[PDB]
Amino acid sequence: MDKTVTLATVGTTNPFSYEKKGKLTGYDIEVAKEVFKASDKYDVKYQKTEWTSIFSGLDSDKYQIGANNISYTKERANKYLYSNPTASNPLVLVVPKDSDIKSYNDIAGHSTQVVQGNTTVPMLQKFNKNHENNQVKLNFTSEDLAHQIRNVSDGKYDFKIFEKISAETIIKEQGLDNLKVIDLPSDQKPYVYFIFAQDQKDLQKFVNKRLKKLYENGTLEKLSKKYLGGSYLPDKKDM
Numbered sequence: 174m175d176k177t178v179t180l181a182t183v184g185t186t187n188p189f190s191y192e193k194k195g196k197l198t199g200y201d202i203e204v205a206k207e208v209f210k211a212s213d214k215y216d217v218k219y220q221k222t223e224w225t226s227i228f229s230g231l232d233s234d235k236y237q238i239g240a241n242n243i244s245y246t247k248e249r250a251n252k253y254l255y256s257n258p259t260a261s262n263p264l265v266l267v268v269p270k271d272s273d274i275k276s277y278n279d280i281a282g283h284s285t286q287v288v289q290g291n292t293t294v295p296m297l298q299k300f301n302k303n304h305e306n307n308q309v310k311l312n313f314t315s316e317d318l319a320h321q322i323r324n325v326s327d328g329k330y331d332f333k334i335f336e337k338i339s340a341e342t343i344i345k346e347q348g349l350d351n352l353k354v355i356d357l358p359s360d361q362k363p364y365v366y367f368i369f370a371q372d373q374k375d376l377q378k379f380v381n382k383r384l385k386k387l388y389e390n391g392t393l394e395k396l397s398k399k400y401l402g403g404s405y406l407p408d409k410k411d412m
């Protein structure tokens with residue numbers, strides 16, 4: 174029978190990866206489904222799992238693909254293969270409207286929630302090394318992004334840093350009308366990607382060939398508009 178490929182996701186990051194009526198959908202998922210439509214070789218299983226388990230399962234080859242609004246880092250690239258980028262998604266600071274927090278450095282001394290292993294953690298840890306007398310209070314949580322965004326709306330925490338597309342989507346869909354988003358600097362292009370277990374070179378090649386085809390023929394843009402709510406593709410030369 175066809176080779177079973179398991180794609181691992183968290184499924185709590187609307188609109189990249191989430192459930193509708195119990196079924197997994199969102200840009201990462203629907204892109205993967207479109208990629209794999211044109212294969213006789215691979216049958217994909219889409220599996221919801223814990224964030225940390227995506228990575229440990231890729232390490233053990235329990236899983237072959239990871240997808241959940243995943244950024245490039247050198248630490249991850251040391252262990253996993255990356256696809257070509259699938260979207261560009263810059264960071265924002267989510268704060269109550271009219272907060273004192275107006276620019277990145279204003280977070281100094283304020284409290285936020287973070288989830289271990291996400292890229293904002295080392296970002297904020299670096300910030301604290303630079304502002305050691307007025308550090309951000311980091312509260313590690315196991316709760317999901319919408320939960321954390323609502324906690325800022327309710328005043329339990331002062332701000333949340335996350336990608337714009339999910340921040341905006343959640344604030345709109347959950348009617349959190351007392352929040353706003355502030356654009357933050359990007360150190361590098363803020364791309365997101367599929368990742369793969371390190372031994373899955375042929376799979377990576379297949380996915381990349383498909384992404385180039387889908388980019389060129391307009392399908393990827395169609396999916397970005399449909400699931401992300403706008404045209405957020407990476408730059409052509411980066412494909």
Ligand SMILES: [Cl-]
Pocket residue numbers: 192
């Ligand atoms: Cl669920």
Ligand SMILES: [Cl-]
Pocket residue numbers: 175212213214
């Ligand atoms: Cl088939």
Ligand SMILES: [Cl-]
Pocket residue numbers: 216
């Ligand atoms: Cl099939």
Ligand SMILES: [Cl-]
Pocket residue numbers: 316317320
């Ligand atoms: Cl919740």
Ligand SMILES: [Cl-]
Pocket residue numbers: 272273283331
């Ligand atoms: Cl405040």
